[PDB]
Design a protein around this nucleic acid. Structure first.
Ligand SMILES: [Zn+2]
Lengths: 189, 144, 143, 139, 160, 101, 120, 72, 55
RNA sequence: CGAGACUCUGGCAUGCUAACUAGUUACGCGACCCCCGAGCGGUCGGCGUAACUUCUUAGAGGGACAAGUGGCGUUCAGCCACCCGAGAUUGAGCAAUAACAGGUCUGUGAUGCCCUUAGAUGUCCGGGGCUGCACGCGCGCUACACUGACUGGCUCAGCGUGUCCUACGCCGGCAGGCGCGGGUAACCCGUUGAACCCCAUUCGUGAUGGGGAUCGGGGAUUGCAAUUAUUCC
């Protein structure tokens, strides 16, 4: 058996949407012990859906300017973040991760169509891989905002967003930003 | 089951060898220890009261790994990141004197031998003391 | 930790108000003349626990910390840690503190201006003293 | 009765010696569990935690490491641990064990037996890096 | 005192570059082709590629002794440690230095610009090349800089 | 006479090809005791120059390089043979620095 | 007046290398390297002008090109004209400048007082 | 707004530490600071008291993150 | 005398004590391998010295 | 002609050629440990022979060609996808014809005119200036913090230079002093003990220990000379 962090298992983790199912990783043969793998996943197109989505949450968390190469900093932020999820919920935190991802990526987006100087967006459809890509970005960004200038830890404030999105609650940052992009799109239609 | 220094968590090995040298009691402590930095690239004086011992303990450890180090190489060893004000940062070495009288104090305990090839190596008595401190950490770890 | 009842929230040292609830290795710095580096060596000659807060202490600890600050060479504090190394009028080593250092920067300014040195004119003119390009920077505060 | 192969990441090069032994895997003189950036400890345990201890039982492994950085030396070892047991199982054990155990590793990660050729590109003038350029200004 | 092997081959480089500019700035109008330094450790034998070998020897070799006396007094290495040699490049059209100096001589002689360029360009293709261009730029008439270009055959421009 | 070290430093490997493989060819033809031609790390002399002699253009640089290829070859013989073969084989740009003991 | 805890007269009669413990680091650095043939000559000529005065009169000015000359305590009470690239400036050596250089009493530049800015 | 935490405990605040805190299921110096108006050093040390009392388990300890739990 | 005041400046350090060995210029010298040429005359004589532009 | 072809580089070689100025393995010898109640085992950048080239270095030769398969193609040019593979588009250098009155007489002993040539526009010397400072506009550096800062501890490079690089003692709080040694260099610096990173410590949302500008005192090196602060402590 291959436990993430030696203590979290994968066979419990259950994907709801078939839309996201082939574009969200670890269930069975993607199961790896650490997020850090360092493989060429952006060598050509549609290879970054085969990398483990904990490593996806890693690589989008080193993202800011002062943190911009420090991956072992980040897989430590991840490791302490799952164990705060488990102590607040008791669920396998990978399931909480996936239930926070699915509820986060929007499903219709606006797009500017027309000549320059004319702003008339039309709603289009959101790709499944982009809905993965949009959600992780919206998840990581909410960890920065409520934890840039206060006592709370980013290994902690990540776990407060990644729980509040698996509720689909209004308290999460990645939910309000889905409730805007997909609110604006249905006024563009 | 013969333990060695290398078979042990190293930053606890240093914490064990440090408190060994206070309990030995005989180690020449300079009188400036209450006063001074360890380098020019350090902001403040080090926090630990007994910092001389753990830096003595660190020094004997590095001699066991490679024998033949001088005073300058030990000043290289505890080197750091000089934050050059609003100019960009660079590497700065330690202090030569704290690196000197550490090697000079542990030479007084017949732990440190001065070499044919210039520097200072570790006496076979000093190799006994490390591997006995190494037992005291390996036992307190694997049996607890 | 615990709840001390002889915890002065407000210290009054050298006419300077020291926040008692701060760590005492960083509440001495609240006066002029003393930074971080000198205050640690003051407290280690006083043999007072660096872990403890500034309001937590007695009076006899406080006034002997004052005494070691006033008279540093007596307590074997070296002469290179000193605020004013060789004062030109007397050649005397001291550490100069809050109302004194305020009073004794004026003495160096009234020296170089009365002598009409180059730096003395700079301070009289308000300009850059250490030999700096004034073409581009140091703009703000003019009309 | 002895097989010695290397592994390699960016500039790190770790060389593992294997012989008929009793289950010791020491890198650079010290044990596997002792190597410092222990946040990546499992990445060094992955040749063991997939093949079990029973394959590393009649084999003694020394690893000799130079070059690279911390992370690059970690991945250079786990090549060389893995490539050697494979190369030990070729010469001294039958080929059918080699295929059996090679297939368990590659399906977990192809990196464990063949190395990344991606090494650092040459910086060019006019900018800080290999592709980047300086700011410029108009008007 | 010996010299670093990095610093040695650089110091051997400044020797040939100064020696070739010496023979360019002097033996230009005397049918020069090239310097061939051949370092024998007894005598630094310097072979001079040229075209008019008789017009650089002098009178029974007056100038060749003058030149090898200049070099000893210049680069400091002592007497009896250098010889000179004149070997003729008979294929004077193949050498670009000779043909750019033969064209220097005719333009200094006050001939026509086009006439000498066609004379050279016809010569070297008759001398067995596979392509050649002659560019002459500068004052040709008036206060305006012009550029002329006399291309014949093939001319590779890029690559190794 | 014993322990004759020969050191070769050229600028091109092609001349160093012809020379270094002919010394070991003729010493073994004279039935001697050789070490193999060992190869030092090649020195690379890098000078980066601006192209413009004005400072006007698009800040374009020239990367000039020089390479030095160094070889070692050892011998164990009376040195009557060494002065014979070596001093004849003169290729320009190839230096022989033979030291003894 | 007192300098480094040394009074006026005790300064004037103090030995040469005893001044190399009252100065600051640049002066002691320079004095250990020693004054030169040009500089004793000025100090020589400064004795003569101070020698030849009536007691109510300041001495006659001695013009000079040495801006990086140390103000020694022999020079106290002298009238010195110092060349600033353009003009010798009459500087009376007051007793409180006895550790400096000469040239920081004769300014090079003029103090700038702007007018209006031009086109650009 | 300003946030002026306490530096040493109060009689009431030390009760909230002793009574309420060991039933949180997630105890952390940032959390205790957030709920009790206490600076990070004091709340970081008070959890080391509550390990010495044995009232509270320990899950993970790091340079920057130390995680505690209610008692079983 | 003028014997004294002629070459009186100590030119063993600084920019004055180095010039180009081809064109006597003392701006932009290449002092690297004991070369001591200006950055133009080196670029001029670079083939004959032996520096081949490869990379 | 340019493009391409080319040269250099990179990637692959447990195949070949070699190695006392590079190593590995083995065997001696020593030091040390737990012991068992002797050992063996182990760690040894501790130092001596032998076996040899995996690692190191550098020479020759192979390697990849849209080759193979499946689709798409006026079905052929070529494209897509995939297997095998180290690699299925490595990064550069060179770069046509024609121009610009673009830049450079301040790179030249490359130069044409004009000007100045002993109350010099030559040249040396002394002192200053290129930095000056109400204000505009550009390339940059360090920051605004807790994915932090500080203090300890721990553990990893590469291209490179060196007659000035430096080791090792000693005295120095520290920049530094003193002595003595190696290296014209894979031989010495050097195993080039780099920094963020890693692990503990301390500090907790405030102009804060973040941030360091600006200022006062001192101390030391370079140089003939630090005044308009060279640089450093
Ligand atoms: Zn020149």
């Amino acid at each position: 058996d291959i436990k993430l962090f030696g203590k979290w298992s994968t066979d419990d983790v259950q994907i709801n949407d078939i839309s996201l199912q082939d574009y969200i990783a670890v269930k069975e043969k993607y199961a790896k012990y650490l997020p850090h793998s360092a493989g060429r996943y952006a060598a050509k197109r549609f290879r970054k859906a085969q990398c483990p989505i904990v490593e996806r949450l890693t690589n989008s968390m080193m993202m800011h300017g002062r943190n911009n190469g420090k991956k072992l900093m980040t897989v430590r932020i991840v490791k302490h973040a799952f164990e705060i999820i488990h102590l607040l919920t008791g669920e396998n935190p990978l399931q909480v991760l996936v239930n926070a991802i699915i509820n986060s990526g929007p499903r219709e987006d606006s797009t500017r169509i027309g000549r320059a100087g004319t702003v008339r967006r039309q709603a289009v459809d959101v790709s499944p891989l982009r809905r993965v890509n949009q959600a992780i970005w919206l998840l990581c960004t909410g960890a920065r905002e409520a934890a840039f200038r206060n006592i709370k830890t980013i290994a902690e404030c990540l776990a407060d967003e990644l729980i509040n999105a698996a509720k689909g609650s209004s308290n999460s940052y990645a939910i309000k930003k889905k409730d805007e992009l997909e609110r604006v799109a249905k006024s563009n239609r | 089951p013969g333990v060695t220094v290398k078979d042990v968590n190293q930053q606890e090995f240093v914490r064990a060898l440090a408190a060994f040298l206070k309990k030995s009691g005989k180690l020449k402590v300079p009188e400036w220890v209450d006063t001074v930095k360890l380098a020019k690239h350090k902001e403040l004086a080090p926090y630990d009261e007994n910092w001389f011992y753990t830096r003595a303990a660190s020094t004997a450890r590095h001699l066991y790994l490679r024998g033949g180090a001088g005073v300058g190489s030990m000043t290289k060893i505890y080197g750091g990141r000089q934050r050059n004000g609003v100019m960009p940062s660079h590497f700065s070495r330690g202090s030569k004197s704290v690196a000197r009288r550490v090697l000079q104090a542990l030479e007084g305990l017949k732990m440190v031998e001065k070499d044919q090839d210039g520097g200072r190596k570790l006496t076979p008595q000093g190799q006994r003391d490390l591997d006995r401190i190494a037992g005291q950490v390996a036992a307190a770890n694997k049996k607890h | 930790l615990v709840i001390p009842e002889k915890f002065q929230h407000i210290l009054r040292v050298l006419n300077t108000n020291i926040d008692g609830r701060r760590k005492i290795a960083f509440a001495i710095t609240a006066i002029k003349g003393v930074g971080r580096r000198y205050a640690h060596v003051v407290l280690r000659k006083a043999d007072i626990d660096l872990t403890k807060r500034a309001g937590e202490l007695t009076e006899d600890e406080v006034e002997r910390v004052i005494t070691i600050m006033q008279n540093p060479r007596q307590y074997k504090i070296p002469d290179w840690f000193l605020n004013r190394q060789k004062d030109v009028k007397d050649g005397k080593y001291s550490q100069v503190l809050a109302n004194g250092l305020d009073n004794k920067l004026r003495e160096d300014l009234e020296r170089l201006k009365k002598i009409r040195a180059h730096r003395g004119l700079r301070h009289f003119w308000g300009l850059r003293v250490r030999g700096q390009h004034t073409k581009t920077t140091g703009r703000r505060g003019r009309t | 009765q002895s097989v010695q192969v290397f592994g390699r990441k960016k500039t790190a090069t770790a060389v593992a010696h294997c012989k008929r032994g009793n289950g010791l895997i020491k890198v650079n003189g010290r044990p596997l569990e002792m190597i410092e950036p222990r946040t990546l400890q499992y990445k060094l345990l992955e040749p063991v935690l997939l093949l079990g201890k029973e394959r590393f039982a009649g084999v003694d492994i020394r690893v000799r490491v130079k070059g690279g950085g911390h992370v690059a030396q970690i991945y250079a070892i786990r090549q060389s641990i893995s490539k050697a047991l494979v190369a030990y199982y070729q010469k001294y054990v039958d080929e059918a064990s080699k295929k059996e155990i090679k297939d368990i590793l590659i399906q977990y990660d192809r990196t464990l037996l063949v190395a990344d050729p991606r090494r650092c590109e040459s910086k060019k003038f006019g900018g800080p890096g290999a592709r980047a350029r300086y700011q410029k200004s108009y008007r | 005192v010996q010299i670093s092997k990095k610093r040695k081959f650089v110091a051997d480089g400044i020797f040939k570059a100064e020696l070739n500019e010496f023979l360019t700035r002097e033996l230009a109008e005397d049918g020069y082709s090239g310097v061939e330094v051949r370092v024998t450790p007894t005598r630094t034998e310097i072979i001079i590629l040229a075209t008019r070998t008789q017009n650089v020897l002098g009178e029974k070799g007056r100038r060749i002794r003058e030149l090898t006396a200049v070099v000893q007094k210049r680069f400091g290495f002592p007497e009896g440690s250098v010889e000179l040699y004149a070997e003729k490049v008979a294929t004077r059209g193949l050498c670009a230095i000779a043909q750019a100096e033969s064209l220097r001589y005719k333009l200094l002689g006050g001939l026509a610009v086009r006439r000498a360029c066609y004379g050279v360009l016809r010569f070297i293709m008759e001398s067995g090349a596979k392509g050649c261009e002659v560019v002459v730029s500068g004052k040709l008439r008036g206060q305006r800089a012009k550029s002329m270009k006399f291309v014949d055959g093939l001319m590779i421009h890029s690559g190794d | 006479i014993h322990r004759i070290r020969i050191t070769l430093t050229s600028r091109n490997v092609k001349s160093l090809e012809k020379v270094c493989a002919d010394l070991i060819r003729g010493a073994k033809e004279k039935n001697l005791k050789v070490k193999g031609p060992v190869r030092m790390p090649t020195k690379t002399l890098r000078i980066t120059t601006r192209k413009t002699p004005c400072g006007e253009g698009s800040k374009t640089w020239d990367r000039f390089q020089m390479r030095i290829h160094k070889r070692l070859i050892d011998l164990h013989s009376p040195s009557e043979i060494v002065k014979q073969i070596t001093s004849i084989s003169i290729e320009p740009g190839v230096e022989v620095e033979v030291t003894i003991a | 007046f007192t300098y480094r805890g040394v009074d006026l007269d005790q300064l004037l009669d103090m030995s040469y290398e005893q001044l190399m413990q009252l100065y600051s680091a640049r002066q002691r650095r320079r004095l250990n390297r020693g004054l030169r043939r040009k500089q004793h000559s000025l100090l020589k000529r400064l004795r003569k002008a101070k020698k030849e005065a009536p007691p109510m009169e300041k001495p006659e000015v001695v013009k000079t090109h040495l801006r990086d000359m140390i103000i020694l305590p022999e020079m106290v009470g002298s009238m010195v004209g110092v060349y600033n690239g353009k003009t010798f400036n009459q500087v009376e050596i007051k007793p409180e400048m006895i550790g400096h250089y000469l040239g920081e009493f004769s300014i090079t530049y003029k103090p700038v007082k702007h007018g209006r800015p031009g086109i650009g | 707004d300003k946030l002026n935490n306490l530096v040493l405990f109060d009689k009431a605040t030390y009760d909230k530490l002793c009574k309420e805190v060991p039933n949180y299921k997630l105890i952390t110096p940032a959390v205790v600071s957030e709920r009790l108006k206490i600076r990070g050093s004091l709340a970081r040390a008070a959890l080391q008291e509550l390990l010495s009392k044995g009232l509270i388990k320990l899950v993970s300890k790091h340079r920057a993150q130390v995680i505690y739990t209610r008692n079983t | 005398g003028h014997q004294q005041l002629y070459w009186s400046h100590p030119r063993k350090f600084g920019q004055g004590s180095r010039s180009c060995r081809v064109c006597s210029n003392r701006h932009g010298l290449i002092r690297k391998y004991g070369l001591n040429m200006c950055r133009q005359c080196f670029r001029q004589y670079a083939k004959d010295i032996g520096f081949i532009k490869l990379d």
